[PDB]
Every structure is written in C-alpha cells, then in structure tokens.
Design a protein around this ligand. Structure first.
Ligand SMILES: O=C(O)C[C@@H](O)CCc1ccc(-c2ccccc2)cc1
Ligand SMILES: [Ca+2]
Ligand SMILES: [Zn+2]
Ligand SMILES: [Zn+2]
Length: 163
C-alpha cells in the first residue's frame, strides 16, 4: 500500500498559465483531466482561485525549486508528486514544451490525466494502452478513454463511484 488522499473532496489551483494556449483552454484541459478520474472513483475535484489548494498546478522551466529541474523542450514533459504533505499532490508542467488543445505539439489534457494519476497515488503501467504508461503518445482526445488497467489501479486506491 502507498499513501493516498484521505478525503474525497479535493481542491486544485492553477498557480500560473502557459502562454501557449489561452486561459479558457488551459482551465478546460485541466478540468477535463480531473473529470477523467472522478468518473471512475468517489473523488470530487474543484478549482479554487485563492487559499492553499490540495493540488497545485504549476507551469515552470528548468530548475524551479524542487530538486527535479526540467530539461527544456522534449524529454520529460511534466512530473507530479503523490499524496503527501507540503509539495504532496502538485503537478508541474515543463513550460519549455509547446502545449496544445489538440495534437499541435504536446497535448495538455492527456499529459494532465497522466500527472493527476500520479498526484492521486498511481505509478507507471507496463500496459501500452494505459494512460499511466511512461510514454506520451497522442490519441484523439474525443475518443480518449482510461484503459482497464488504469481503472483497476485507481479503484484499488479509492474504490468505485457510489450508488
Ligand atoms: O512520467 C511522468 O510522469 C513524466 C512525463 O514526462 C510523462 C508524460 C506523459 C504524458 C502522457 C502520457 C500518455 C498520453 C496519452 C495516452 C497515454 C499516455 C504518458 C506520459
Ligand atoms: Ca522537457
Ligand atoms: Zn517540479
Ligand atoms: Zn509518469
């Protein structure tokens, strides 16, 4: 067993915004990524604009103060921290990538789903169909669906949705 969030209502805050997409699209990509996970668990996610959030969403480049500097465009696209104190739960997105609403460059939505996965306590999957698979690969975002391995992994930590 690993650490998990100990409450079902979780807040998130977007600390800053990439200039690559407007505010609405960043908000939307992120909201929809949390929704992928709340659809298969009892978890509820909500965006806040002031105060300390459970999960902080940050865009940053190179060294940004957590001992895991980013590596410019390509390579690692983002990273996140599992349920914990302090930094616990935050999701950082390498601002040197080029973030897009679709397949223009690095899809923000798919990346967010992957990273939120980590923020929720999940690790990597060896299943090539899983969102938690270690390698980014674009998939039509209107067709996107968690894999069975993803769902079994997240339900093992939080259970399924209630009646
Ligand atoms: O491993 C990490 O958390 C650091 C990041 O560099 C990894 C980014 C990433 C982003 C999307 C995916 C993915 C995207 C679509 C479908 C399945 C997986 C996989 C991986
Ligand atoms: Ca990078
Ligand atoms: Zn970081
Ligand atoms: Zn990962």
């Amino acid at each position: 067993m690993g650490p998990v969030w100990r409450k079902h209502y979780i807040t998130y805050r977007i600390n800053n915004y990439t200039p690559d997409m407007n505010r609405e699209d960043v908000d939307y990509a992120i909201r929809k990524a949390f929704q992928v996970w709340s659809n298969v668990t009892p978890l509820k996610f909500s965006k806040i604009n002031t105060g300390m959030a459970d999960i902080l969403v940050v865009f940053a480049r190179g060294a940004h103060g957590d001992f895991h500097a980013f590596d410019g465009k390509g390579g690692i696209l983002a990273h996140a921290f599992g349920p914990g104190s302090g930094i616990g739960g935050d999701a950082h997105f390498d601002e040197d990538e080029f973030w897009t609403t679709h397949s223009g460059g690095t899809n923000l939505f798919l990346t967010a789903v992957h990273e939120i996965g980590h923020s929720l306590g999940l690790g990597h999957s060896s299943d090539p169909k899983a969102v938690m698979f270690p390698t980014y690969k674009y998939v039509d975002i209107n067709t996107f669906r968690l894999s069975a391995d993803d769902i079994r992994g997240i339900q093992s930590l939080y259970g399924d949705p209630k009646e």
